[PDB]
C-alpha cells in the first residue's frame, strides 16, 4: 500500500504528523508514505522508516512570481512528481483550502481529509472524496492519528504516539552526547522570547554544575543574541550554522533542552529529548508539545519578563526526575 500525505507547513505541524505514520506502519505491514512538504522541512519526513518519496513545495516563495519562467519550471516539475503515482489513498492532514486546491486536488487516488465541521477551513472539505469527523478538542498529534486510522481502516492505538525519528540519529550521535544541554532562544515574536538577561542568569546558575550549553542560530540576529548569551561563560558554545538535520543531530545528543515556544522545541519533542518550554503569550494547552518528557513552564501573568531564571532552574530541579 502506498499513501500520499499532504501536510506542508509549520515545522511543528509536520512533526506532529509522525506518530500517525508509526501507528499505520504497525497496523499495516509494508505500507509506505510519500509526503508533500514545504522545502524548508523536506528532511523531516525522510527520517521516518515508513516514508519513501518526499515531494517538496514552496508555496509562499512561488507565490511571489508565480508565472515567471523559473517558478513555472519548478511548479511543472512539482505537478509531474505529485501526479506520477496512483495512490491507494491521499490523506490531507492540513485542512486548508490553499493546499487542498493546489495539491490534494491534483493527486491520483481516493482523497481523505477532515470534514466541514472539523477542517481548519470548512471549505477545504469539499476537495476530498472521504470526509472524516475529527474532534477539535485534543492534541494535534492525536487528531492526525485519528485521521490516519479512520482513512486507513484501523483503530487508533491507545498508547502514547511515537514520532519514531530518534532512531535515525541514535546510530550517529555526537561524540559528546549527554554532556550538554541546548537552549533554544529564537522564536517568531517579540513577546514569545525570554529576555536575554534571564537566559544569561539561568546560564550563570549552572556555572558550577559541570554541564556545557550549546546555542543554535539560523539568522544573523539570532547569532548576535547567541553570542551575547554566551559572552563570559566558558562552558557555553555557539554552534556553527547548520542544516535542520544538523541541528536535529545536536538536539538528539542533548541531555535536556530549555526552550521558548518555537519550531525547534517541537523538533526536540519529536526526538524524545527532555525539554522545558517556557510560555508567555501562547497557551501550552492549545499549542504545546507532545512527548511525555516535555515539560511546560508558564510565565507569571503570561509575561515572560516575569519568569525568573531561578524559577526555571527550580522548575528543572523539581522535574529532574522526568529529564
mmCIF file with all atom_site columns, C-alpha atoms in Angstrom, residues 168-275:
data_model
loop_
_atom_site.group_PDB
_atom_site.id
_atom_site.type_symbol
_atom_site.label_atom_id
_atom_site.label_alt_id
_atom_site.label_comp_id
_atom_site.label_asym_id
_atom_site.label_entity_id
_atom_site.label_seq_id
_atom_site.pdbx_PDB_ins_code
_atom_site.Cartn_x
_atom_site.Cartn_y
_atom_site.Cartn_z
_atom_site.occupancy
_atom_site.B_iso_or_equiv
_atom_site.pdbx_formal_charge
_atom_site.auth_seq_id
_atom_site.auth_comp_id
_atom_site.auth_asym_id
_atom_site.auth_atom_id
_atom_site.pdbx_PDB_model_num
ATOM 1   C CA . UNK A 1 168 ? 17.604 7.848  12.652 1.00 0.00 ? 168 UNK A CA 1
ATOM 2   C CA . UNK A 1 169 ? 20.100 9.733  14.839 1.00 0.00 ? 169 UNK A CA 1
ATOM 3   C CA . UNK A 1 170 ? 20.941 7.278  17.626 1.00 0.00 ? 170 UNK A CA 1
ATOM 4   C CA . UNK A 1 171 ? 23.183 5.459  15.135 1.00 0.00 ? 171 UNK A CA 1
ATOM 5   C CA . UNK A 1 172 ? 25.414 8.532  14.792 1.00 0.00 ? 172 UNK A CA 1
ATOM 6   C CA . UNK A 1 173 ? 25.033 10.731 17.885 1.00 0.00 ? 173 UNK A CA 1
ATOM 7   C CA . UNK A 1 174 ? 27.615 13.446 18.598 1.00 0.00 ? 174 UNK A CA 1
ATOM 8   C CA . UNK A 1 175 ? 30.654 12.135 20.468 1.00 0.00 ? 175 UNK A CA 1
ATOM 9   C CA . UNK A 1 176 ? 29.713 14.362 23.420 1.00 0.00 ? 176 UNK A CA 1
ATOM 10  C CA . UNK A 1 177 ? 26.066 13.238 23.678 1.00 0.00 ? 177 UNK A CA 1
ATOM 11  C CA . UNK A 1 178 ? 24.748 13.750 27.208 1.00 0.00 ? 178 UNK A CA 1
ATOM 12  C CA . UNK A 1 179 ? 27.496 16.196 28.183 1.00 0.00 ? 179 UNK A CA 1
ATOM 13  C CA . UNK A 1 180 ? 25.487 19.243 27.192 1.00 0.00 ? 180 UNK A CA 1
ATOM 14  C CA . UNK A 1 181 ? 22.099 20.940 27.179 1.00 0.00 ? 181 UNK A CA 1
ATOM 15  C CA . UNK A 1 182 ? 20.738 23.043 24.334 1.00 0.00 ? 182 UNK A CA 1
ATOM 16  C CA . UNK A 1 183 ? 18.986 26.371 24.918 1.00 0.00 ? 183 UNK A CA 1
ATOM 17  C CA . UNK A 1 184 ? 16.554 27.347 22.158 1.00 0.00 ? 184 UNK A CA 1
ATOM 18  C CA . UNK A 1 185 ? 16.151 31.111 22.382 1.00 0.00 ? 185 UNK A CA 1
ATOM 19  C CA . UNK A 1 186 ? 14.901 32.002 18.921 1.00 0.00 ? 186 UNK A CA 1
ATOM 20  C CA . UNK A 1 187 ? 11.269 32.366 18.014 1.00 0.00 ? 187 UNK A CA 1
ATOM 21  C CA . UNK A 1 188 ? 8.820  34.355 15.834 1.00 0.00 ? 188 UNK A CA 1
ATOM 22  C CA . UNK A 1 189 ? 7.540  37.115 18.075 1.00 0.00 ? 189 UNK A CA 1
ATOM 23  C CA . UNK A 1 190 ? 8.969  39.676 20.480 1.00 0.00 ? 190 UNK A CA 1
ATOM 24  C CA . UNK A 1 191 ? 6.764  38.704 23.439 1.00 0.00 ? 191 UNK A CA 1
ATOM 25  C CA . UNK A 1 192 ? 7.399  34.958 22.920 1.00 0.00 ? 192 UNK A CA 1
ATOM 26  C CA . UNK A 1 193 ? 11.099 35.446 23.724 1.00 0.00 ? 193 UNK A CA 1
ATOM 27  C CA . UNK A 1 194 ? 12.549 35.059 27.217 1.00 0.00 ? 194 UNK A CA 1
ATOM 28  C CA . UNK A 1 195 ? 14.618 38.218 27.939 1.00 0.00 ? 195 UNK A CA 1
ATOM 29  C CA . UNK A 1 196 ? 18.347 37.715 27.290 1.00 0.00 ? 196 UNK A CA 1
ATOM 30  C CA . UNK A 1 197 ? 19.011 38.950 30.813 1.00 0.00 ? 197 UNK A CA 1
ATOM 31  C CA . UNK A 1 198 ? 17.116 35.948 32.159 1.00 0.00 ? 198 UNK A CA 1
ATOM 32  C CA . UNK A 1 199 ? 18.774 33.461 29.805 1.00 0.00 ? 199 UNK A CA 1
ATOM 33  C CA . UNK A 1 200 ? 22.174 34.735 30.963 1.00 0.00 ? 200 UNK A CA 1
ATOM 34  C CA . UNK A 1 201 ? 21.159 34.406 34.610 1.00 0.00 ? 201 UNK A CA 1
ATOM 35  C CA . UNK A 1 202 ? 19.990 30.828 34.066 1.00 0.00 ? 202 UNK A CA 1
ATOM 36  C CA . UNK A 1 203 ? 23.321 30.099 32.383 1.00 0.00 ? 203 UNK A CA 1
ATOM 37  C CA . UNK A 1 204 ? 25.110 31.670 35.335 1.00 0.00 ? 204 UNK A CA 1
ATOM 38  C CA . UNK A 1 205 ? 23.226 29.407 37.741 1.00 0.00 ? 205 UNK A CA 1
ATOM 39  C CA . UNK A 1 206 ? 24.616 26.326 36.010 1.00 0.00 ? 206 UNK A CA 1
ATOM 40  C CA . UNK A 1 207 ? 28.214 27.569 36.034 1.00 0.00 ? 207 UNK A CA 1
ATOM 41  C CA . UNK A 1 208 ? 29.472 25.087 38.641 1.00 0.00 ? 208 UNK A CA 1
ATOM 42  C CA . UNK A 1 209 ? 27.306 22.131 37.537 1.00 0.00 ? 209 UNK A CA 1
ATOM 43  C CA . UNK A 1 210 ? 29.835 20.863 35.009 1.00 0.00 ? 210 UNK A CA 1
ATOM 44  C CA . UNK A 1 211 ? 27.303 20.938 32.197 1.00 0.00 ? 211 UNK A CA 1
ATOM 45  C CA . UNK A 1 212 ? 28.042 22.502 28.821 1.00 0.00 ? 212 UNK A CA 1
ATOM 46  C CA . UNK A 1 213 ? 25.415 24.540 26.954 1.00 0.00 ? 213 UNK A CA 1
ATOM 47  C CA . UNK A 1 214 ? 25.112 24.883 23.156 1.00 0.00 ? 214 UNK A CA 1
ATOM 48  C CA . UNK A 1 215 ? 23.239 27.691 21.417 1.00 0.00 ? 215 UNK A CA 1
ATOM 49  C CA . UNK A 1 216 ? 21.830 27.423 17.849 1.00 0.00 ? 216 UNK A CA 1
ATOM 50  C CA . UNK A 1 217 ? 21.193 30.253 15.391 1.00 0.00 ? 217 UNK A CA 1
ATOM 51  C CA . UNK A 1 218 ? 19.834 30.373 11.860 1.00 0.00 ? 218 UNK A CA 1
ATOM 52  C CA . UNK A 1 219 ? 19.763 34.074 11.100 1.00 0.00 ? 219 UNK A CA 1
ATOM 53  C CA . UNK A 1 220 ? 22.187 36.936 11.816 1.00 0.00 ? 220 UNK A CA 1
ATOM 54  C CA . UNK A 1 221 ? 20.036 38.479 14.537 1.00 0.00 ? 221 UNK A CA 1
ATOM 55  C CA . UNK A 1 222 ? 19.861 35.068 16.184 1.00 0.00 ? 222 UNK A CA 1
ATOM 56  C CA . UNK A 1 223 ? 23.622 34.599 16.074 1.00 0.00 ? 223 UNK A CA 1
ATOM 57  C CA . UNK A 1 224 ? 24.114 38.042 17.581 1.00 0.00 ? 224 UNK A CA 1
ATOM 58  C CA . UNK A 1 225 ? 21.866 37.148 20.509 1.00 0.00 ? 225 UNK A CA 1
ATOM 59  C CA . UNK A 1 226 ? 23.549 33.743 20.894 1.00 0.00 ? 226 UNK A CA 1
ATOM 60  C CA . UNK A 1 227 ? 26.948 35.444 21.153 1.00 0.00 ? 227 UNK A CA 1
ATOM 61  C CA . UNK A 1 228 ? 25.606 37.864 23.771 1.00 0.00 ? 228 UNK A CA 1
ATOM 62  C CA . UNK A 1 229 ? 24.243 34.981 25.839 1.00 0.00 ? 229 UNK A CA 1
ATOM 63  C CA . UNK A 1 230 ? 27.497 33.000 25.646 1.00 0.00 ? 230 UNK A CA 1
ATOM 64  C CA . UNK A 1 231 ? 29.648 36.028 26.478 1.00 0.00 ? 231 UNK A CA 1
ATOM 65  C CA . UNK A 1 232 ? 31.719 35.266 29.566 1.00 0.00 ? 232 UNK A CA 1
ATOM 66  C CA . UNK A 1 233 ? 30.796 31.600 30.008 1.00 0.00 ? 233 UNK A CA 1
ATOM 67  C CA . UNK A 1 234 ? 33.485 29.087 29.028 1.00 0.00 ? 234 UNK A CA 1
ATOM 68  C CA . UNK A 1 235 ? 31.014 26.198 29.207 1.00 0.00 ? 235 UNK A CA 1
ATOM 69  C CA . UNK A 1 236 ? 28.702 27.781 26.636 1.00 0.00 ? 236 UNK A CA 1
ATOM 70  C CA . UNK A 1 237 ? 29.218 27.333 22.913 1.00 0.00 ? 237 UNK A CA 1
ATOM 71  C CA . UNK A 1 238 ? 27.562 28.974 19.939 1.00 0.00 ? 238 UNK A CA 1
ATOM 72  C CA . UNK A 1 239 ? 27.012 26.314 17.299 1.00 0.00 ? 239 UNK A CA 1
ATOM 73  C CA . UNK A 1 240 ? 28.094 26.880 13.685 1.00 0.00 ? 240 UNK A CA 1
ATOM 74  C CA . UNK A 1 241 ? 25.297 27.422 11.179 1.00 0.00 ? 241 UNK A CA 1
ATOM 75  C CA . UNK A 1 242 ? 23.783 24.085 10.131 1.00 0.00 ? 242 UNK A CA 1
ATOM 76  C CA . UNK A 1 243 ? 21.014 22.285 8.276  1.00 0.00 ? 243 UNK A CA 1
ATOM 77  C CA . UNK A 1 244 ? 17.828 21.154 10.008 1.00 0.00 ? 244 UNK A CA 1
ATOM 78  C CA . UNK A 1 245 ? 19.228 17.631 10.049 1.00 0.00 ? 245 UNK A CA 1
ATOM 79  C CA . UNK A 1 246 ? 22.411 19.048 11.560 1.00 0.00 ? 246 UNK A CA 1
ATOM 80  C CA . UNK A 1 247 ? 20.639 20.803 14.425 1.00 0.00 ? 247 UNK A CA 1
ATOM 81  C CA . UNK A 1 248 ? 18.412 17.734 14.902 1.00 0.00 ? 248 UNK A CA 1
ATOM 82  C CA . UNK A 1 249 ? 21.574 15.702 15.497 1.00 0.00 ? 249 UNK A CA 1
ATOM 83  C CA . UNK A 1 250 ? 22.807 18.233 18.059 1.00 0.00 ? 250 UNK A CA 1
ATOM 84  C CA . UNK A 1 251 ? 19.401 18.106 19.753 1.00 0.00 ? 251 UNK A CA 1
ATOM 85  C CA . UNK A 1 252 ? 19.419 14.304 19.657 1.00 0.00 ? 252 UNK A CA 1
ATOM 86  C CA . UNK A 1 253 ? 22.634 14.419 21.715 1.00 0.00 ? 253 UNK A CA 1
ATOM 87  C CA . UNK A 1 254 ? 21.396 16.904 24.323 1.00 0.00 ? 254 UNK A CA 1
ATOM 88  C CA . UNK A 1 255 ? 20.773 15.628 27.854 1.00 0.00 ? 255 UNK A CA 1
ATOM 89  C CA . UNK A 1 256 ? 17.932 18.160 28.046 1.00 0.00 ? 256 UNK A CA 1
ATOM 90  C CA . UNK A 1 257 ? 16.733 21.351 26.429 1.00 0.00 ? 257 UNK A CA 1
ATOM 91  C CA . UNK A 1 258 ? 15.269 24.615 27.644 1.00 0.00 ? 258 UNK A CA 1
ATOM 92  C CA . UNK A 1 259 ? 13.296 26.486 25.011 1.00 0.00 ? 259 UNK A CA 1
ATOM 93  C CA . UNK A 1 260 ? 10.745 29.105 24.075 1.00 0.00 ? 260 UNK A CA 1
ATOM 94  C CA . UNK A 1 261 ? 7.623  28.207 22.044 1.00 0.00 ? 261 UNK A CA 1
ATOM 95  C CA . UNK A 1 262 ? 9.321  27.714 18.655 1.00 0.00 ? 262 UNK A CA 1
ATOM 96  C CA . UNK A 1 263 ? 9.674  25.199 15.820 1.00 0.00 ? 263 UNK A CA 1
ATOM 97  C CA . UNK A 1 264 ? 12.843 23.581 17.207 1.00 0.00 ? 264 UNK A CA 1
ATOM 98  C CA . UNK A 1 265 ? 11.063 22.943 20.511 1.00 0.00 ? 265 UNK A CA 1
ATOM 99  C CA . UNK A 1 266 ? 8.660  20.672 18.605 1.00 0.00 ? 266 UNK A CA 1
ATOM 100 C CA . UNK A 1 267 ? 11.687 19.039 16.933 1.00 0.00 ? 267 UNK A CA 1
ATOM 101 C CA . UNK A 1 268 ? 13.201 18.426 20.376 1.00 0.00 ? 268 UNK A CA 1
ATOM 102 C CA . UNK A 1 269 ? 9.932  16.759 21.412 1.00 0.00 ? 269 UNK A CA 1
ATOM 103 C CA . UNK A 1 270 ? 9.913  14.591 18.268 1.00 0.00 ? 270 UNK A CA 1
ATOM 104 C CA . UNK A 1 271 ? 13.402 13.374 19.145 1.00 0.00 ? 271 UNK A CA 1
ATOM 105 C CA . UNK A 1 272 ? 12.163 12.341 22.611 1.00 0.00 ? 272 UNK A CA 1
ATOM 106 C CA . UNK A 1 273 ? 14.539 14.726 24.400 1.00 0.00 ? 273 UNK A CA 1
ATOM 107 C CA . UNK A 1 274 ? 13.589 16.111 27.867 1.00 0.00 ? 274 UNK A CA 1
ATOM 108 C CA . UNK A 1 275 ? 12.525 19.681 27.285 1.00 0.00 ? 275 UNK A CA 1
#
